Design a protein around this ligand. Structure first.
Ligand code: CLA
Ligand code: CLA
Ligand code: CLA
Ligand code: CLA
Ligand code: CLA
Ligand code: CLA
Ligand code: CLA
Ligand code: CLA
Ligand SMILES: CCCCCCCCCCCCCCCC(=O)OC[C@H](COP(=O)(O)OC[C@@H](O)CO)OC(=O)CCCCCCCCCCCCCCC
Ligand SMILES: CC1=C(C/C=C(\C)CCC[C@H](C)CCC[C@H](C)CCCC(C)C)C(=O)c2ccccc2C1=O
Ligand code: SF4
Lengths: 70, 39, 739, 332
């Protein structure tokens, strides 16, 4: 429940699942504040990558607090 | 303030100032001399 | 994306001396005295003065700042009266015995008898608004904090006034700034509602929880630590809760289970003080803050991600509904009246939700014990909610008359709903008549069966019983909820569904409310009156464009008396007169609702408590077999409980008697405006102008009678004022006599 | 620094505009030195109000007051502070020095011009650029005496103006006549982590200030001949990288010096000497643990000086890559 590689592992796994989700189904992605490159994932941009990382954290708190009591 | 003298002399503000002055002198006369059913 | 024009309107006082300049027909000259009433009837009709959608919107924005100054100076007056002329520290020394009072009366004509002995030697008028329990829930200790809060409120009142002048005469925004409705929606979601909920969650964590914890322990006044001393010394906060020694660090690693000792899910009530748990409400406001700020990022403004609502409304179209919501995004961002109708509908239903939730889950300490506070807060929020719902029915009709352009919304939901107005209203009045017979004729039937001496043929519980099985099953599910369908909850959502009797200071806070056949009949009475008011307002909305009686109703305006005596007679046909009828029907609906509330709570809920467990109520359980009769509603409720308003002279509850009779006077005075028509009074006033012309004192302002809409408006205003003043005086004097 | 003559810099990269102007270059760099002098004086007065004499200095989180208790300013016997006011005079001077350095910060960007080549008097001999090696050697040459001056100011403080606090005898030791041999300085490279010697601390500081004053007279009088120019570069971000990698090394060895030493960082004020741990990152974890979730000042100083010098090493990589012939190169 504290800092561990297990909770960080399921956090990073569901986070990059959320990045793949945002790269698959966001209607308009690129037109925001431009990212310096496309090395991370896709062609997102600053606001778009902040959004899909925040959804990675929302999904992260979801499965982590859904498994910390189960 | 050539318009403030006209706004303070409209009908609601003048009738409210007159009723405030009338209620003021009535309440003051009823404090210093209360309970006068007759003369 | 900010678009501001600079100095649109010059600041000048010369326009204040010329009343009626905003409208074209009023600035010519007061040739007639009806101009005076028109000066108040069009003073806020900003859509009739300007017709460009940009001047009216900034006029609305500055009017919002002015009204916000009015609310801030009202709230400043509440905190100042609680600071200077109250007994808040005296009530905090002894909350159970003495009674709060935040208004002292100047003895001038004998009204010093209104300053009754509220307990502790302090005289004054006992307040029923119950904001003392709000202050104890927030964490106020002495009168100086209330005084500085009143000072800061007056500072923000002058700040809002300066912002109104700045946003109308210095830097006023453009129309595109107002039409940015997605940015407005997500800022109001996150930065206003969610950020304000997070602020109050932080105040409930730091101030409201430790102060109420040590006040529930029994610490006297002038011994509580100051609220900033818990932040300045976290050891005083860590000795009350063990989780505060863990710091911020478990919150960020999602180790929230160690925060369980001070963010609980207890529910129910606090048995020591008779209110909600402050840890429960702190966890509650934090959860609302998280959910609102999450929902505060849904709408795209500048960064690509987000839902623009236009294709949301495009995507919802079915087989029954034609083209769906195609056009509503262009409606609701170009017409302020449609936004006003939706917001008044949902704020009215919100205020009724507030009343229906602040009686079975009392959120404030020692609020459920004070019966006058509970009854007054319930009925006042019920009345504000019903008023705002009638205003929704008004501004829907104003949108139909003056803000509805039929060329833009073809075969959408608005056009399809206006296309079958008969198939809506002719079923709505059918269910009105069906509910009317089956909620009132039940009352007449067992009134007649009781009057004919046959109680076995009534609709009582011993008689033919109409058991409300659905809400009884729902109460069974709420009683069975903690442990089966809410396992981390200790108590129920409330103790009104089912559970133990909460007793605090010899009185009853909340016991389970069983629903017999009397509650069945009065709930169908409530559904009936709700349906009739939702019939008059809905057929004022739909039949505001045109009809088969008069098909030229849109060109005549929203607010016109009649089309004439032809077609049999067309008086009260406008969309305004449906609001005029719906105001009385809201009055009747809410009067029966608050009567059912007051009688059921003082017959089955309230009363004193005894140490062996038995509960004796205020009216000894009259609602079971005597709330099913109209004579039972008259004798056992309106005659028996009005004796505390009647026999209270020469005492503290003496102003309520001369407000009881005052409300009867304004009702009876309203009947003169409602029953009579204008032309009689015009034919009489012209005779008084003759009697003035005989003495050369006839005024050059032409004196003539009120308009027909004005006569109906003053009739419904004095009717609602007189009835609400009568119910206010009765409810306050009764519930202050019973404790 | 590459490409055309003038490149459009946005507001998120706007400090790359005054790099060649040399008039506003002094204005930002003494506004920065005013901010460190502001943090020198205000945050040792911030910690006077949050000071507990009965409680121990380690668990409270006191940072700057152990730094003055190391120099023997107001420490008494047993490891406690007998007077607060000598910590208040030094913080008052650093705040006044923050005012006058902040005063001249707006002088070199409001009244003084954008360069120093328009002047005619003594100020005409102060303009510099990123090309002339003899113009950057006179700037660097006058700096090397001031770094050597702090060693002799340390000597005059230690010999004749106050003692030092240690852990071998745990008292203020007004020492004098240090060691006079340089051979043990070659041997201290392998056990500098535990010096265990007070007379050699001031004895090595005089033995390094004589070297720092040697580099001062050398760098002023002669210019670079050319043996350094053929191996190095002379540009804007070039000379930035020589320093920013060097100060990263200084923060590296100071983050190591905090966690393991006992004499220069006394354990009666900073806390017990830490143990080097590596999980995901190398962090100097505490040996004993606190009752609450707090850490000692030795745990805060050693961890922050390592995390931030690591970013200052990788920021040296950001400037050394751009000072050489390398673009962003987002290919494939
Ligand atoms: C026909 C109308 C009428 C008349 C002739 C009077 C006459 C009087 N009233 Mg009165 N009153 C009236 C209507 C009237 N009232 C109404 C409608 C109210 C309710 C607002 C009152 C409320 C009132 C109070 C509260 C008091 C009087 C008092 C008085 C007496 C003294 C007044 C004064 O200032 O000296 C006087 C006999 C005073 C008194 O003491 O009476 C003896 C006094 O204290 N009146
Ligand atoms: C996240 C930032 C934010 C916040 C906190 C608010 C807050 C508010 N806005 Mg607002 N607004 C915002 C962004 C924001 N807005 C943006 C970006 C736009 C343009 C798209 C608008 C456009 C807008 C309009 C057109 C109107 C408001 C109004 C209001 C007030 C609503 C009710 C009220 O008075 O509450 C009570 C007051 C408070 C809770 C005080 C909180 C604010 C303090 C001073 C900070 C409230 C103060 C309405 C108004 O004028 O009300 C007076 C109104 O008509 N807003
Ligand atoms: C807007 C709301 C708000 C504000 C201003 C604060 C402010 C503060 N909280 Mg805090 N807190 C909040 C909401 C808020 N909290 C909520 C919603 C929770 C529940 C998750 C907490 C739980 C919390 C804990 C557990 C602790 C603080 C502490 C603190 C203080 C330390 C400063 C800091 O960086 O943190 C600070 C006064 C710390 C403290 O006690 O310092 C006085 C501390 O240990 N807070
Ligand atoms: C968010 C709230 C809100 C807002 C902004 C508006 C705004 C508006 N309404 Mg409105 N309305 C509302 C709620 C609201 N309403 C509600 C809740 C109802 C149901 C009661 C109505 C019913 C209503 C009607 C029936 C009409 C409007 C009209 C109007 C427009 C012109 C206002 C005007 O001329 O009145 C100016 C202000 C006054 C005339 C003052 C009214 C004074 C009242 C009657 C007495 C108050 C009694 C007081 C509380 C008791 C103490 C007094 C005394 C005993 C001391 C304006 C756009 C009119 C319109 O659009 O016509 C084209 C119109 O005919 N409204
Ligand atoms: C106490 C007086 C009174 C009564 C009884 C009614 C009754 C009614 N009003 Mg109403 N109304 C009133 C005052 C009253 N109003 C006032 C003061 C206003 C002013 C604002 C309005 C404004 C108003 C509007 C605006 C509307 C109504 C409507 C209605 C009808 C709703 C249907 C219903 O309840 O089922 C019928 C219930 C009854 C008739 C009462 C029950 C009485 C018993 C059960 C019937 C008698 C039994 C039997 C026939 C006796 C036989 C004896 C034999 C010799 C004949 C209903 C007839 C609505 C309507 O007609 O459409 C649905 C409508 O839209 N009213
Ligand atoms: C003393 C050392 C030093 C100096 C003089 C400079 C100087 C410069 N750098 Mg730089 N840099 C440094 C260290 C330094 N850097 C380090 C250590 C890193 C690694 C992190 C970087 C990474 C870096 C990048 C990635 C870029 C620069 C750029 C630049 C140039 C433009 C100024 C700028 O960044 O925009 C003005 C300054 C800002 C906008 C400030 C940014 C602050 C952000 C918004 C918040 C970051 C967190 C913040 C520090 C708060 C955290 C507090 C912490 C205690 C937790 C300028 C010549 C830019 C450049 O040359 O353009 C091509 C550029 O893109 N630098
Ligand atoms: C230690 C902090 C610090 C200091 C001392 C300075 C100092 C300076 N900045 Mg600066 N800056 C800083 C942080 C700082 N900045 C940060 C964090 C950002 C990012 C928001 C910027 C973004 C910035 C821009 C965009 C510009 C400056 C400019 C300037 C110069 C001012 C020239 C003028 O008045 O116009 C001056 C040397 C200006 C400049 O050099 O133009 C001559 C300029 O255009 N700065
Ligand atoms: C040649 C490089 C060099 C090295 C290896 C050191 C190393 C040291 N210095 Mg130091 N110092 C240097 C140059 C150097 N200094 C220069 C050039 C100056 C003048 C600005 C100083 C001024 C200075 C002071 C004023 C103090 C130190 C102190 C210290 C010791 C603990 C601080 C630390 O963690 O340092 C890494 C440490 C042995 C402290 C100490 O222990 O002395 C009592 C102390 O108080 N130094
Ligand atoms: C209840 C049935 C239900 O809610 O259906 C609602 C149904 C909705 O129609 P559609 O399925 O076409 O709706 C798609 C909508 O989502 C688009 O607005 O409309 C009606 O049948 C109107 C009659 C309501 C009155 C029903 C009697
Ligand atoms: C009496 C009556 C009139 C006559 C109405 C009149 C003469 C209005 C009377 C107004 C007088 C001047 C009283 C002033 C109103 C308030 C008391 C003003 C407040 C002033 C204080 C604050 C000082 C109508 O015009 C009418 C029209 C349609 C249906 C019914 C009726 C109706 O019943
Ligand atoms: S009675 Fe009055 S409102 Fe009715 S039709 Fe005749 S004039 Fe119009």
């Amino acid at each position: 429940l504290s800092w561990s590689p297990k909770v960080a592992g399921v956090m990073i796994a569901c986070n990059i699942l959320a990045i793949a989700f945002g790269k698959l189904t966001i209607k308009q992605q690129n037109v925001g504040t431009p990212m310096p490159s496309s090395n991370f994932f896709g062609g997102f941009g600053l606001g778009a990558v902040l959004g899909t990382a925040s959804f990675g954290h929302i999904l992260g708190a979801g499965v982590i607090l859904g498994l910390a009591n189960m | 303030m050539d318009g403030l003298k006209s706004f303070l002399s409209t009908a609601p503000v003048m009738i409210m100032a007159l009723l405030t002055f009338t209620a003021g002198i009535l309440i003051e006369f009823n404090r210093f001399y209360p309970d006068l059913l007759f003369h | 994306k900010v678009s501001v024009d600079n100095n649109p309107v010059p600041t000048s006082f010369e326009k204040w001396g010329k009343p009626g300049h905003f409208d074209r027909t009023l600035a010519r000259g007061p040739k007639t005295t009806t101009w005076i009433w028109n000066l108040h009837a069009n003073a806020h009709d900003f859509d009739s003065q300007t017709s460009d959608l940009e001047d009216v919107s900034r006029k609305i924005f500055s009017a919002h700042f002015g009204h916000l100054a009015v609310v801030f100076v009202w709230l400043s007056g509440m905190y100042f009266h609680g600071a200077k002329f109250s007994n808040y520290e005296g009530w905090l020394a002894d909350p159970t015995h003495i009674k709060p009072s935040a208004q002292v009366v100047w003895p001038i004509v004998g009204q010093g008898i209104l300053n009754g002995d509220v307990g502790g030697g302090f005289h004054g008028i006992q307040i029923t608004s119950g904001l003392f329990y709000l202050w104890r829930a927030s964490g106020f200790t002495d009168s100086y904090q209330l005084y500085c809060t009143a000072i800061g409120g007056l500072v923000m009142a002058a700040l809002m006034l300066f912002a109104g002048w700045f946003h109308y005469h210095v830097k006023a925004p453009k129309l595109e700034w107002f039409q940015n409705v997605e940015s407005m929606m997500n800022h109001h979601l996150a930065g206003l509602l969610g950020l304000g909920s997070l602020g109050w969650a932080g105040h409930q964590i730091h101030v409201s929880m430790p102060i109420n914890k040590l006040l529930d322990a029994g610490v006297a006044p002038k011994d509580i630590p100051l609220p900033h001393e818990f932040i300045l010394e976290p050891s005083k906060m860590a000795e009350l809760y063990p989780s505060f020694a863990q710091g911020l660090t478990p919150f960020f690693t999602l180790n929230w289970g160690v925060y369980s000792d001070f963010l609980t899910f207890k529910g129910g009530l606090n048995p020591v003080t008779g209110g909600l748990w402050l840890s429960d409400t702190a966890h509650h406001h934090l959860a609302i803050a998280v959910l609102f700020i999450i929902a505060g990022h849904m709408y795209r403004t500048n960064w690509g991600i987000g839902h623009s609502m236009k294709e949301i409304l495009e995507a919802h179209k079915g087989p029954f509904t034609g083209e769906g919501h195609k056009g509503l995004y262009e409606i609701l961002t170009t017409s302020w009246h449609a936004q006003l109708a939706i917001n008044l509908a949902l704020l009215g239903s919100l205020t009724i939700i507030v009343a229906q939730h602040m009686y079975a889950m009392p959120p404030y300490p020692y609020q459920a014990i004070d019966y006058a506070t509970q009854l007054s807060l319930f009925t006042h929020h019920m009345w504000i909610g019903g008023f705002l719902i009638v205003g929704a029915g008004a501004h829907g009709a104003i949108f139909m008359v003056r803000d509805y352009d039929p060329a833009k919304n073809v075969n959408n939901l608005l056009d399809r709903m206006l296309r079958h107005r008969d198939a809506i209203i002719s079923h709505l009045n059918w269910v009105c008549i069906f509910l009317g017979f089956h909620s009132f004729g039940l009352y007449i039937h067992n009134d007649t069966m009781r009057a004919l001496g046959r109680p076995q043929d009534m609709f009582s519980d011993t008689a033919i019983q109409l058991q409300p099985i659905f809400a009884q099953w729902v109460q069974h599910l709420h009683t069975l909820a903690p442990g089966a369908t809410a396992p981390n909850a200790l108590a129920t959502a409330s103790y009104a569904f089912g559970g133990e009797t909460i007793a605090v200071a010899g009185k009853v806070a909340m016991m389970p409310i069983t629903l017999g056949t009397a509650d069945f009949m009065v709930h169908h009475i409530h559904a009936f009156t709700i349906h009739v008011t939702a019939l008059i307002l809905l057929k004022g909305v739909l039949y505001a464009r045109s009809s088969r009686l008069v098909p030229d109703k849109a060109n005549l305006g929203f607010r016109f008396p009649c089309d004439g005596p032809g077609r049999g007679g067309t008086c009260q046909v406008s969309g305004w007169d449906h609001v005029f009828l719906g105001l009385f029907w809201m009055y009747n609906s809410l009067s029966v609702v608050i009567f059912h509330f007051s009688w059921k709570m003082q017959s089955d809920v309230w009363g004193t408590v005894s140490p062996d467990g038995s509960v004796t109520h205020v009216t000894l359980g009259n609602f079971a077999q005597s709330a099913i009769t109209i004579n039972g509603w008259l004798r056992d409720f309106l005659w028996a409980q009005a004796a505390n308003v009647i026999n209270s002279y020469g005492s503290a509850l003496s102003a309520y008697g001369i407000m009881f009779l005052a409300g009867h006077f304004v009702f009876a005075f309203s009947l003169m405006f409602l029953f009579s028509g204008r032309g009689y009074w015009q034919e009489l006033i012209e005779s008084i102008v003759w009697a003035h012309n005989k003495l050369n004192v006839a005024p050059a302002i032409q004196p003539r009678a009120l308009s027909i809409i004005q006569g109906r408006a003053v009739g419904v205003a004095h009717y609602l004022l007189g009835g609400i003043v009568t119910t206010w005086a009765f409810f306050l004097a009764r519930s202050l006599s019973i404790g | 620094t590459y490409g055309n003559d003038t490149v459009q810099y946005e507001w998120w990269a706007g400090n790359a505009r005054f790099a060649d102007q040399s008039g506003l270059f002094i204005a930002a760099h003494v506004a920065q030195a005013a901010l460190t002098a502001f943090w020198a004086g205000a945050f040792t007065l911030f910690e006077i109000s949050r000071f507990d004499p009965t409680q121990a200095m380690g668990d409270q989180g006191l940072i700057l007051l152990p730094h003055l208790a190391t120099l023997g300013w107001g420490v008494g016997d047993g490891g406690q502070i007998v007077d607060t006011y000598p910590y208040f005079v030094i913080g008052s001077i650093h705040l006044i020095a923050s005012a006058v350095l902040g005063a001249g910060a707006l002088f070199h960007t409001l009244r003084a011009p954008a360069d120093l080549s328009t002047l005619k008097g003594q100020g005409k001999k102060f303009h510099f650029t990123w090309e002339n090696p003899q113009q950057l050697g006179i700037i660097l040459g006058h700096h090397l005496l001031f770094l050597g001056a702090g060693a002799l100011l340390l000597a005059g403080k230690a010999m004749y103006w106050g003692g030092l606090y240690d852990a071998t005898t745990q008292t203020v030791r007004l020492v004098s006549q240090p060691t006079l041999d340089p051979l043990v300085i070659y041997g201290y490279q392998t056990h500098f982590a535990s010096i265990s010697s007070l007379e050699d601390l001031v004895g090595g500081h005089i033995f390094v200030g004589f070297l720092l004053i040697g580099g001062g007279i050398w760098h002023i009088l002669v210019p670079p001949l050319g043996w350094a120019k053929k191996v190095l570069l002379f540009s804007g971000e070039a000379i930035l990288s020589y320093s920013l990698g060097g100060i990263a090394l200084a923060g590296f060895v100071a983050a190591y010096f905090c966690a393991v030493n006992t004499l220069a960082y006394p354990p009666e004020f900073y806390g017990p000497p830490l143990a080097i741990k590596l999980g995901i990152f190398p962090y100097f974890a505490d040996t004993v643990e606190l009752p609450m979730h707090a850490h000692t000042s030795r745990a805060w100083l050693a961890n922050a000086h390592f995390f931030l010098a690591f970013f200052f090493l990788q920021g040296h990589l950001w400037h050394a890559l751009r000072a050489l012939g390398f673009d962003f190169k987002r290919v494939e």
